[PDB]
Assembly symmetry: C2
Homo-oligomer: 174 residues x 2
């Protein structure tokens, strides 16, 4: 298991695009930033990381993501969360557009990351096989405090289940 071991960053890296004041409600001309998982974790004492199968998942379908967005103020203000990282294998531009559609106006404390080719997600066994050697991220959530995993769980059916990956389940562990 991962729980109570150091966050297994390895050489894995993720990409995201920032959203801020001006470009929040308009179109950005911004190239992706690349960030090593070890750097993110080294620089932030309290980090939530949550995987999602697909950017632009239809709103009719079950999701844990809106919950994290709704709860962000409490996470950052009352629960001292430094970062919330939403993870998909989707390209960073699509992840960013998706974040904006969901109401994100500021990525200071929440970032929508690409895990290219599901490499990090496969490495911690939280992937979702979709066919033919292709992997999306499953639905899962992780808490990292001071470089140490204090909670990690993935859904049995990412299609239908929002339980252990929910912001509420996670709140109980922070």
């Amino acid at each position: 298991d991962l729980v109570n071991k150091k966050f297994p960053a390895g050489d894995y890296k993720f990409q995201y695009i920032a959203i801020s004041q001006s470009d929040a409600d308009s179109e950005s001309c911004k190239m992706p930033q690349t960030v090593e998982w070890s750097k993110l974790i080294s620089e932030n004492k309290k980090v939530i990381i949550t995987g999602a199968p697909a950017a632009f998942s239809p709103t009719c379908t079950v999701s844990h993501i809106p919950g994290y967005i709704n709860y962000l103020d409490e996470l950052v203000k009352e629960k001292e969360v430094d970062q919330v990282i939403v993870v998909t294998v989707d390209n960073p531009f699509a992840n960013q557009a998706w974040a904006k559609s969901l109401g994100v106006k500021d990525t200071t404390h929440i970032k929508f990351a690409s895990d290219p080719g599901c490499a990090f997600t496969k490495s911690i066994g939280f992937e979702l096989a979709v066919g033919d050697g292709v992997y999306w991220s499953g639905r899962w959530a992780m808490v990292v405090e001071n470089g140490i995993v204090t909670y990690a769980a993935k859904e049995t059916n990412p299609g239908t289940d929002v339980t252990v990956s929910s912001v509420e389940s996670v709140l109980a562990h922070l």
Copy 2:
């Protein structure tokens, strides 16, 4: 080369979501359809296929895709094109959202496909290596008439070049 040779469909398949009358300007609750390349090609005498590196590429960067959308009427009405298929490795939900953002209200003659894991695109040598064993589609375009490739070309620099993949270059070949 591919030109003048039967379209190499193999067992490759793609996924897309439809857009139509009602859901054109709203949110669909629709799952992806899977379509075999051989079926698409068997059922349509004149097909254009064009690869793009990334759904939601920023508007500030070069793109051949808006051209195809602008020119769709002429393609379907005057040039008798049955299908225009835009190909990315991105998930079909993201591809659909992308299409709508670009002004597509009807997928009768234009579909935004996922080529999962870049498998079809790799097979014809039109892929774009982005690092660490991960492949996006390059920028390219192909004309298939009566099951036979009559044009196929990819950009040397998909980042900066819209030449051989442009709707204009393709128009000259229909």
